[PDB]
């Protein structure tokens, strides 16, 4: 019965071609609910889920202000990074940040995050205890030292344990019809000859939420991984997800193979076989 | 609810 809220922000410099592009998005579990894009006409936080549309103008104004406050800070952090790494104005650089919180089924705080990457590499991260930092290099060690002295971890823990949880709990209630309701996978198996003597069996899971799912193949009731393929879980575009798993088998031996599906929305795991 | 990040590197 646990839930997460996550914000994902990306700043990409383009010196001389205007201010850096800043994009932020916010998720509750696997559902996107807001975006901000510095290149959009509005220059405002915008809704990306039906249930956030309830929020009044005070919400949109204040969230807009906060996200812009972050974008200004991170533009400056891009400058600082250039100095610490001794990089020119010619390059496009990327500063990414993720923060958010995890709550248990009764709303109790489980975990917080507050972390940064520069050009695709870890820069600095708030540790599990929310009292200390991991720096990835000499540059980030300078940042770590400042933030330790300035007791920045304390302010971030205050946000993570407070506002972050408070917000998440409110969105969960307001969005309960879709946020708190599991969608079980609809399943089926397909069969494709590849020669006179081999076939591909494909086990499908469709229309499920949340994204977490496990598909496994067995042969004669024994786990089978040889000759199997698994695609990455993918968005359908309507709020649900898709995945499949496949195995190449000797034609005539299809019946020995079973696909097993585990998902939160299933009261019991599913076992599938090809049934033409 | 967003975190109004103020802190520089």
């Amino acid at each position, epitope marked *: 019965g646990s839930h997460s809220m996550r914000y994902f922000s990306t700043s990409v410099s383009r010196p001389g071609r205007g201010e850096p592009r800043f994009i932020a998005v916010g998720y509750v579990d696997d559902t996107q609910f807001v975006r901000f894009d510095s290149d959009a006409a509005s220059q405002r936080m915008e809704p990306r889920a039906p249930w956030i549309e309830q929020e009044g103008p005070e919400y949109w104004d204040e969230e807009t202000g906060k996200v812009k*406050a972050h974008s200004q800070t991170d533009r400056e952090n891009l400058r600082i990074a250039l100095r610490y790494y001794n990089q020119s104005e010619a390059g496009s650089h990327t500063l990414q940040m993720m923060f958010g919180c995890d709550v248990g089924s009764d709303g109790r705080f489980l975990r917080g995050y507050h972390q940064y990457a520069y050009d695709g590499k870890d820069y600095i991260a708030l540790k599990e205890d929310l009292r200390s930092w991991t720096a990835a290099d000499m540059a980030a060690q300078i940042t770590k030292r400042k933030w330790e002295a300035a007791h920045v971890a304390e302010q971030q823990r205050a946000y993570l344990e407070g506002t972050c*949880v408070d917000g998440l709990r409110r969105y969960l209630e307001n969005g309960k019809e879709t946020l708190q309701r599991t969608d079980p996978p609809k399943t089926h198996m397909t069969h494709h000859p590849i020669s006179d003597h081999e076939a591909t069996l494909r086990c499908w899971a469709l229309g499920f939420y949340p994204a977490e799912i496990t598909l496994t193949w067995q042969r004669d009731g024994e786990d089978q991984t040889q000759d199997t393929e698994l695609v990455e879980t993918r968005p359908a575009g309507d709020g649900t997800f898709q995945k499949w798993a496949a195995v190449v088998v000797p034609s005539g031996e299809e019946q020995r193979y079973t696909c097993h599906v585990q998902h939160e929305g299933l009261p019991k795991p599913l076992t599938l076989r090809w049934e033409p | 609810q967003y975190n109004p990040i103020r802190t520089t590197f």
Partner: single-chain antibody
Amino acid sequence: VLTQPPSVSVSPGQTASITCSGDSLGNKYACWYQQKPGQSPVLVIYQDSKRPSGIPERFSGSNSGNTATLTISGTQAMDEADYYCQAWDSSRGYTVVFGTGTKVTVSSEVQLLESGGGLVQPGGSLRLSCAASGFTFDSYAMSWVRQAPGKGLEWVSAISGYGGSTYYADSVKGRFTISRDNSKNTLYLQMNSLRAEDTAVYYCAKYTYFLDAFDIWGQGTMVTVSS
């Protein structure tokens, strides 16, 4: 942290320039607040150069390098007041900072209502309240900002919209506790182990991230630690 000249003297009609310097101004907006004696602070400039509705055009602002400047052109007798710059300390997570203030002498439905102030013995306790009206209370972070007699504004404490996050100045940490009853549209400040240095008018101030300023101020409640 935010340095301002002690005073500026002008004659009616001439331009008055008030400066404020600090590293954070480089990557943060400057606000300016006017305060006439007997009256509470008023926002005159936000986001470096923007005036709130109702503020006269003769007040302007800029913020370049690490300096912010409030200019009053054609300064009038009614402009005699103390002016405070305000930004955020970018070295810190959540720390509002007011400039030292400048005394400018000229010579030839929204509502916050504070209460609870009064005389208290040294090492005593007191609880302050503020009732809010005319805006969606739980949509805004609320602060207490104090002013000792004849001194500047000092931000004391802040609380998030739904109350889960609270923030304190180093000066009051461990001794004061901010909280809110959103159903009562009321903010509180529990003050323990009071000292001489706590003697001040305590203002309730509403912050808006949209403007990045305290746009609404109450009338204050006076706390005197004596005897």
